[PDB]
Write a protein that binds this ligand. Sequence first.
Ligand SMILES: Cc1ccc(O)c(C)c1-c1cc(-c2ccncc2)cc(C(N)=O)c1N
Length: 276
Amino acid sequence: HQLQPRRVSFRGSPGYDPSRPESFFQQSFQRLSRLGHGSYGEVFKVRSKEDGRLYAVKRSMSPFRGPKDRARKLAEVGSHEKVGQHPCCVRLEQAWEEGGILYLQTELCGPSLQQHCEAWASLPEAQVWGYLRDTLLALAHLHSQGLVHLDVKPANIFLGPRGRCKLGDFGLLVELGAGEVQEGDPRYMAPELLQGSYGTAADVFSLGLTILEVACNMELPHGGEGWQQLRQGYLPPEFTAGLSSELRSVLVMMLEPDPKLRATAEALLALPVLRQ
Ligand SMILES: Cc1ccc(O)c(C)c1-c1cc(-c2ccncc2)cc(C(N)=O)c1N
């Protein structure tokens, strides 16, 4: 026998019949496509039987190994719930566990920025400015909730309608103690994180490298001298071919190595170039 699905929430089932053998996920959604699969599990595009609408569902790959493994996986939901509703953040609809598998159902978004870049070379800069602005709005929101994303990168930002984008993957959020967390991508890591230091500035730095990468369509270094030379407070000319003066200047504000001097998200959003 199998336990009924249980909702996962850190706050406080229609068309679904517990008498039937099939899972809540099998009963309650029509699977339309698989959007991704990895170590973590799989992400499907689905339509909900409850309301007829499209959603994305991520399910973990194998049953929990013990109580701490379970607790660590469930913590993604608690972090995501802390983000709540914001037009530039992937919205969680509900989460549940069944069969030792964790499910997160979110709004359905478009391709990640990584995927978008791979299937476009170099993006029109007008598009890039919109992605920068929307993800800065996301970070202003996170910081207001006392949260820092330690893995801002092209794979974790998803396109929406009319040039919009949404930040996701909130299992790598930490609170301002911090909470257990995994490794962020070294390509986009703020330099102060080498010393375990973090704060609201760190994801501004990662967003700077994220936007640099998608604007120049070149691979950023994961270590070595090239990694150091992106953390000195200038842009190596290797990366700036075809970047406008305006975009270059804003990225250099974001890439200041001293996090005490680095621009805040709100200061960046207040620049004339990022109006509206
Ligand atoms: C389901 C979910 C739960 C929590 C979360 O933080 C996020 C980002 C997701 C989410 C993940 C993906 C995805 C696509 C390929 N590879 C990895 C991930 C796509 C979407 C999407 N296109 O809607 C999506 N909402």
